[PDB]
Nucleic acid binder design. Structure first.
Length: 186
DNA sequence: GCTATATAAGGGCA
DNA sequence: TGCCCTTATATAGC
């Protein structure tokens, strides 16, 4: 699909974070007692942690009725898993709705299949880069348009994060592609 | 396991 | 105020 992805590479979506408002106060201890695949340690974190096999995800359910869903490989899968959780809560006795579902972070990654001269890339783009190999082996590239953060490795492996729309993930990778090429390690 | 990245939700505390 | 708490996930040298 060289028309949409000129580099001929499509970043793989790895993790999606979403939120939804169940729109009802939830008794968390009641839920932690009735729910099987759930864990709740208020002294550690103020949320019940639930999980489902398909789509493989984890939800953080708060007393406020708010809910975080993480782990899905796509946006649809995240909405889908979010709905299965809402229905679990519904079946637990709370008048749970599904208000304001929103994708909050999309995580993707790809392999350009060639090593990068991270120091040169960093040096040529100081304004956007943070490369301190002794702290983290990857170059932290904070792209301005779109506002996306890329983790660039010597191996040619790239992690694109911070997107709320998958096109931001694709766009960021397309913008960075010619840059990675410019600093290919020979 | 850790280091780092983005992100939401909450309680708790300087 | 504002930071960390926790969860997921790719990446990789500790």
């Amino acid at each position: 699909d060289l028309s949409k992805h000129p580099s001929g590479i499509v970043p793989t979506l790895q993790n999606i974070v979403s939120t939804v408002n169940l729109d009802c106060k939830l008794d968390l201890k009641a839920i932690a007692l009735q729910a099987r695949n759930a864990e709740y340690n208020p002294k550690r974190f103020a949320a019940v942690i639930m999980r489902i096999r398909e789509p493989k995800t984890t939800a953080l359910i708060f007393a406020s009725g708010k809910m975080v869903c993480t782990g899905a490989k796509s946006e649809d899968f995240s909405k889908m898993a979010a709905r299965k959780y809402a229905r679990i809560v519904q079946k637990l006795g709370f008048p749970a709705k599904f208000k304001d579902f929103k994708i909050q972070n999309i995580v993707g990654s790809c392999d350009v299949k060639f090593p990068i001269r991270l120091e040169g890339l960093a040096y040529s783009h100081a304004a956007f880069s943070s490369y301190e190999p002794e702290l983290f082996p990857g170059l932290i590239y904070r792209m301005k348009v779109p506002k996306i953060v890329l983790l660039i490795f010597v191996s040619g492996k790239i992690v694109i994060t911070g997107a709320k729309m998958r096109d931001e993930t694709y766009k960021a990778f397309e913008n960075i592609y010619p840059v990675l090429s410019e600093f290919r390690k020979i």
